[PDB]
Write an enzyme that holds these catalytic residues in place. Structure first.
Site, mmCIF file in Angstrom:
data_model
loop_
_atom_site.group_PDB
_atom_site.id
_atom_site.type_symbol
_atom_site.label_atom_id
_atom_site.label_comp_id
_atom_site.label_asym_id
_atom_site.label_seq_id
_atom_site.Cartn_x
_atom_site.Cartn_y
_atom_site.Cartn_z
ATOM 1 N N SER A 63 2.853 -8.730 2.792
ATOM 2 C CA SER A 63 2.616 -7.446 3.451
ATOM 3 C C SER A 63 1.190 -7.254 3.960
ATOM 4 O O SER A 63 0.944 -6.274 4.667
ATOM 5 C CB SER A 63 2.992 -6.275 2.541
ATOM 6 O OG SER A 63 4.381 -6.282 2.239
ATOM 7 N N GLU A 272 -4.549 0.987 3.145
ATOM 8 C CA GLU A 272 -4.653 2.127 2.248
ATOM 9 C C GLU A 272 -6.128 2.456 2.048
ATOM 10 O O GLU A 272 -6.957 1.556 1.886
ATOM 11 C CB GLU A 272 -4.000 1.801 0.902
ATOM 12 C CG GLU A 272 -2.509 1.519 1.060
ATOM 13 C CD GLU A 272 -1.893 0.856 -0.136
ATOM 14 O OE1 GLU A 272 -2.608 0.626 -1.142
ATOM 15 O OE2 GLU A 272 -0.678 0.562 -0.063
ATOM 16 N N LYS A 312 -5.242 -3.551 0.431
ATOM 17 C CA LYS A 312 -3.821 -3.779 0.668
ATOM 18 C C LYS A 312 -3.375 -4.969 -0.167
ATOM 19 O O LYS A 312 -4.033 -6.016 -0.162
ATOM 20 C CB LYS A 312 -3.543 -4.081 2.147
ATOM 21 C CG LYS A 312 -2.062 -4.237 2.468
ATOM 22 C CD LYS A 312 -1.401 -2.877 2.579
ATOM 23 C CE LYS A 312 0.105 -2.988 2.792
ATOM 24 N NZ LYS A 312 0.826 -3.353 1.541
ATOM 25 N N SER A 315 2.863 -9.654 -0.774
ATOM 26 C CA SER A 315 3.579 -10.730 -1.439
ATOM 27 C C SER A 315 4.698 -11.240 -0.549
ATOM 28 O O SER A 315 5.317 -10.478 0.205
ATOM 29 C CB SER A 315 4.212 -10.260 -2.758
ATOM 30 O OG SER A 315 3.236 -9.770 -3.674
HETATM 31 B B1 LIG Z 1 4.841 -6.213 0.909
HETATM 32 O O1 LIG Z 1 4.196 -7.217 0.238
HETATM 33 O O2 LIG Z 1 4.539 -5.033 0.315
HETATM 34 C C1 LIG Z 1 6.420 -6.426 0.988
HETATM 35 C C2 LIG Z 1 7.272 -5.822 -0.151
HETATM 36 N N1 LIG Z 1 6.913 -6.358 -1.453
HETATM 37 C C3 LIG Z 1 7.393 -7.524 -2.071
HETATM 38 C C4 LIG Z 1 6.754 -7.624 -3.305
HETATM 39 C C5 LIG Z 1 6.898 -8.705 -4.382
HETATM 40 O O3 LIG Z 1 7.553 -9.764 -4.187
HETATM 41 O O4 LIG Z 1 6.318 -8.521 -5.485
HETATM 42 N N2 LIG Z 1 5.902 -6.555 -3.447
HETATM 43 N N3 LIG Z 1 6.004 -5.765 -2.298
HETATM 44 N N4 LIG Z 1 6.671 -7.843 1.028
HETATM 45 C C6 LIG Z 1 7.902 -8.323 1.572
HETATM 46 O O5 LIG Z 1 8.746 -7.588 1.997
HETATM 47 C C7 LIG Z 1 8.077 -9.822 1.569
HETATM 48 S S1 LIG Z 1 9.726 -10.119 2.224
HETATM 49 C C8 LIG Z 1 10.001 -11.837 1.819
HETATM 50 N N5 LIG Z 1 9.209 -12.622 1.040
HETATM 51 N N6 LIG Z 1 9.723 -13.930 0.929
HETATM 52 C C9 LIG Z 1 10.847 -14.155 1.577
HETATM 53 N N7 LIG Z 1 11.540 -15.424 1.600
HETATM 54 S S2 LIG Z 1 11.409 -12.718 2.426
#
Ligand SMILES: *[B]([O])([O])[C]([C]N1[C]=C(C([O])=O)N=N1)[N]C(=O)[C]SC1=NN=C([N])S1
Length: 359
Positions: A63, A272, A312, A315
């Site tokens: 993200s 943020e 920010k 992951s």
């Molecule tokens: B972002 O990092 O905020 C968002 C949502 N998210 C995921 C996590 C975690 O895994 O702890 N924390 N917040 N990140 C995503 O939506 C990543 S989507 C994908 N990641 N790997 C894939 N194969 S699809």
């Protein structure tokens, strides 16, 4: 250098223990202070190849990708290609006169449509499926009033930004935004020549994995990859936008303006934002389940805090990212890992380092 050695000591004290605690194969931690970059590398970018993490290692930002989307949006807006009061059907014509064309671009970018979840539905994969999802979308909560952190929301924002620039989104970043920021190894699509430098991520079973790109929001919401030197340059740009040419400078500045507040957090474009000095608990609270997973009523900005800091987390399934910068102290920090670790650990370790660095 004695300054090099103080910083390495702090990162060893605060970030290195996380490697054993969470079984993390590889990590890059960067600090920039007073325009000087410090890069610390640990472990392996590929376990099977015994390839070390180094200055060339490409990590998935998850993200943190949203920060580049936000910068692209600020770029397009300051070039007059979009207005934040516009709605998506002005640019994606098939959305004209559908309910989602009541939502403006700023509201999409800052997660306040009132009815968009963290992810697209599982069955929404093809371009036509994404288009049908948006045409069939109907409102739930009062538009603009509730922040619900959302990949499809900022994905639609990114799609509109790309349409306004008459380029596919990946090209907006790789041809316009990354070069304006001086980045040399940041990618939506890692080229064949760079695959030797693309780390594997690792799941909790220690299997090598890399991000699966789904539909149209992967790029704007979570599909950017980058290196430690590039991310430090991106923090440098955010610390010193006045050093950059006007187009990208205005873009960066656009991402620093609080758009509304939720408790102690100000939601800027992508970043943020927090009044500085910010307590550890405030920084931790921004990544609480309540803030990340649920809708929360927003409050309009009365007065922007005069001294600010920003962060920010990001992951993918195989990678963890954290970036933070403090303009007043001309300092920032980047953490990249090729295994997820809890966000609270990222924030706590960065907080300890930044508050212990001498002037
Ligand atoms: B972002 O990092 O905020 C968002 C949502 N998210 C995921 C996590 C975690 O895994 O702890 N924390 N917040 N990140 C995503 O939506 C990543 S989507 C994908 N990641 N790997 C894939 N194969 S699809």
């Amino acid at each position: 250098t004695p300054k090099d050695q103080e910083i390495k000591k702090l990162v060893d004290q605060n970030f290195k223990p996380l490697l054993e605690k969470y079984d993390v194969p590889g990590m890059a931690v960067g600090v920039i202070q007073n325009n000087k970059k410090y890069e610390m590398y640990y472990g392996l970018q590929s376990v099977q190849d015994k390839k070390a993490v180094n200055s060339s290692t490409i990590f998935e930002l998850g993200s943190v990708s949203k920060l580049f989307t936000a910068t692209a949006g600020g770029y397009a807006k300051n070039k007059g290609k979009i207005s934040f009061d516009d709605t998506p059907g002005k640019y994606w014509k098939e959305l004209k006169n559908t309910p989602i064309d009541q939502v403006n671009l700023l509201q999409l970018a800052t997660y306040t449509s009132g009815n968009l979840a963290l992810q697209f539905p599982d069955e929404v994969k093809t371009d036509q499926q994404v288009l049908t999802f948006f045409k069939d979308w109907k409102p739930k909560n009062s538009i603009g009033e509730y922040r619900q952190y959302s990949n499809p929301s900022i994905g639609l924002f990114g799609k509109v930004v790309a349409l306004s620039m008459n380029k596919p989104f990946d090209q907006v970043l790789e041809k316009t935004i990354f070069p304006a920021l001086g980045l040399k190894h940041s990618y939506v699509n890692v080229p064949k020549t760079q695959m030797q430098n693309y780390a594997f991520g690792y799941n909790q079973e220690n299997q090598p994995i890399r991000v699966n790109r789904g539909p149209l929001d992967a790029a704007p919401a979570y599909d950017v990859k980058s290196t430690l030197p590039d991310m430090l340059s991106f923090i440098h740009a955010n610390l010193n936008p006045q050093k950059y040419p006007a187009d990208i400078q205005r873009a960066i500045n656009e991402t620093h303006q609080g758009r509304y507040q939720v408790n102690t957090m100000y939601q800027a474009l992508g970043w943020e934002e927090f009044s500085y000095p910010a307590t550890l608990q405030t920084l931790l609270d921004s990544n609480s389940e309540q803030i990340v997973m649920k809708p929360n009523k927003v409050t309009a900005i009365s007065k922007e805090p005069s001294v600010k800091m920003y962060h920010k987390t990001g992951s993918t399934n195989g990678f963890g990212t954290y970036v933070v910068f403090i303009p007043k102290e001309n300092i920032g920090l980047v953490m990249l890992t090729n295994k997820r670790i809890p966000n609270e650990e990222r924030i706590k370790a960065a907080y300890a380092v930044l508050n212990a660095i001498k002037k």
